[PDB]
Design a protein around this ligand. Structure first.
Ligand code: CA
Length: 121
């Protein structure tokens, strides 16, 4: 089972913020909750996470520190699930966020966007 205010799907617990923070501060917040910024491993996981998104741009655990996209937990990016908006990312420090429709885009990591934490059960 998951902590109160988190939602369960398969082997993960998810928490959706109601306020915004820079990408790195969001990652620190999730780490302190024994979690990480969400890593989208599959279409099924994408579909679950996206229905809880609000209208705010929302960080995921994907960033481009040295001209290579990397998931925060070391999940392989190039062979992994991707759900970019068409033509995106077009400017690749850069961090990935969800649009309200669940598709991904990039912006600078300082923006105070909402975020999602993901933890084990
Ligand atoms: Ca995941």
């Amino acid at each position: 089972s998951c902590p109160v205010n988190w939602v369960e799907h398969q082997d993960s617990c998810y928490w959706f913020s109601h306020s915004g923070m820079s990408w790195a501060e969001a990652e620190k917040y999730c780490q302190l909750k024994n979690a990480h910024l969400v890593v989208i491993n599959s279409r099924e996981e994408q579909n679950f996470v996206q229905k809880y998104l609000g209208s705010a741009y929302t960080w995921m655990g994907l960033s481009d520190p040295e001209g290579a996209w990397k998931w925060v937990d070391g999940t392989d990016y190039a062979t992994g699930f991707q759900n970019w908006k068409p033509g995106q990312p077009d400017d690749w420090e850069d961090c990935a966020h969800f649009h309200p429709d669940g598709r991904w885009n990039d912006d600078v990591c300082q923006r105070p966007y909402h975020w999602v934490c993901e933890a084990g059960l």
